[PDB]
């Protein structure tokens, strides 16, 4: 005659760190699959996207200071950018600063291309070498 599940929420709201649980007060499994301390927050995702628009792809050292101060594995960025553009080889786009409007298109375009080509895995287009 206690609902533990509800009890969990309100506690989780005032007690647990913002990343740990959702606004409703449910607990977000994203935080718990990633290690540490290595969590990638929505908000700093916006920052990656913003960073590409300002400094361009493969500008991580310049991009890193501005939006992530330490802040991130150089790899995590490039891997995440591969995701933004929907390709798995990001080489083609390097050194180009791309607007958020356009990252959306490239991703949209690259994926459609992958799907028809029938070479898109995990929602990322695979690129021939």
């Amino acid at each position: 005659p206690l609902d533990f599940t509800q009890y969990a929420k309100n506690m989780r709201k005032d007690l647990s760190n913002q990343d740990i649980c959702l606004e409703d007060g449910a607990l977000n499994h994203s935080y718990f699959l990633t290690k540490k301390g290595q969590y990638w927050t929505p908000l700093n995702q916006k920052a990656l996207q913003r960073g590409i628009e300002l400094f361009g792809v493969g500008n991580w050292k310049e991009i890193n200071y501005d939006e992530f101060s330490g802040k991130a594995n150089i790899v995590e960025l490039e891997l995440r950018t591969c995701m933004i553009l929907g390709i798995n080889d990001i080489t083609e786009y390097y050194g180009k600063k791309i607007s958020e409007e356009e990252q959306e298109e490239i991703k949209k375009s690259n994926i459609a291309k992958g799907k028809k080509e029938n070479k898109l895995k995990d929602n990322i287009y695979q690129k021939l070498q």
């Binding site: 533990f4 969990a8 309100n10 989780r12 607990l27 994203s30 995990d122």
Partner: protein, 215 residues
């Protein structure tokens, strides 16, 4: 070989690409849904907030508490003793894991917080049946959980004679305690509020509050 190395890297990014995608789709955490992890350092922690909320959403206080203090060889020994445990629970059991170095001190510690020592759980490490420990005077093949009580357990919630002093499990990623402790806690308290301090990520369970700086 460059070709070999170049080849692996693409294969690798794909996993990551997949995992992030699965997460996007709702892939579950190992953690049970009902657990209530909190990340803090106890020294930093104000336990008032925890008490206010617990009283607020349960109108009750913890049935059980658990500890594996990070004994210095690393929180100051004084700091753990000085934690405001007494406020945290009013009518319940406490568990605490004492390395042989701290065994006496631990005793003095629970008594300090007003507990009465009533039982000790023993944990053996099985080869899969023996443990090799570099004991100072006798080699150690167990560590042990010291249990103390305060208040009325004559209450329905705690069930007497429901658990065994000895526990039998293999050691994983030590220091990681046997699963079966949480079962044994089910015997003692069935479906009642529990707490745990110094908690690591792996050991979270439903209905269990947990505080550690690694969460």
């Amino acid at each position: 070989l460059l070709q070999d190395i170049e080849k692996r890297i693409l294969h690798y990014k794909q996993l990551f690409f997949k995992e992030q995608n699965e997460i996007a789709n709702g892939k579950r955490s190992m953690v049970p849904d009902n657990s209530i992890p909190i990340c803090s350092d106890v020294t930093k922690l104000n336990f008032q907030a925890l008490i206010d909320a617990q009283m607020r959403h349960a109108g009750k206080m913890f049935d059980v508490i658990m500890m594996d203090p990070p004994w210095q060889l690393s929180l100051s020994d004084e700091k753990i003793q000085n934690m405001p445990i007494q406020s945290l629970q009013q009518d319940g059991f406490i568990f605490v894991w004492a390395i042989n170095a701290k065994y006496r001190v631990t005793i003095k510690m629970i008594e300090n917080w007003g507990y009465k020592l009533v039982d000790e759980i023993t944990w053996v490490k099985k080869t899969v049946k023996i443990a090799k420990g570099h004991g100072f005077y006798l080699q150690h093949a167990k560590e042990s959980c010291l249990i103390g009580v305060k208040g009325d357990v004559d209450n329905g919630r705690f069930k007497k004679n429901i658990a065994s002093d000895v526990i039998f499990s293999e050691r994983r990623g030590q220091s990681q305690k046997p699963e079966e402790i949480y079962q044994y806690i089910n015997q003692l308290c069935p479906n009642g509020n529990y707490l745990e301090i110094f908690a690591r990520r792996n050991n979270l369970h439903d209905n269990w509050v947990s505080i550690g700086n690694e969460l």
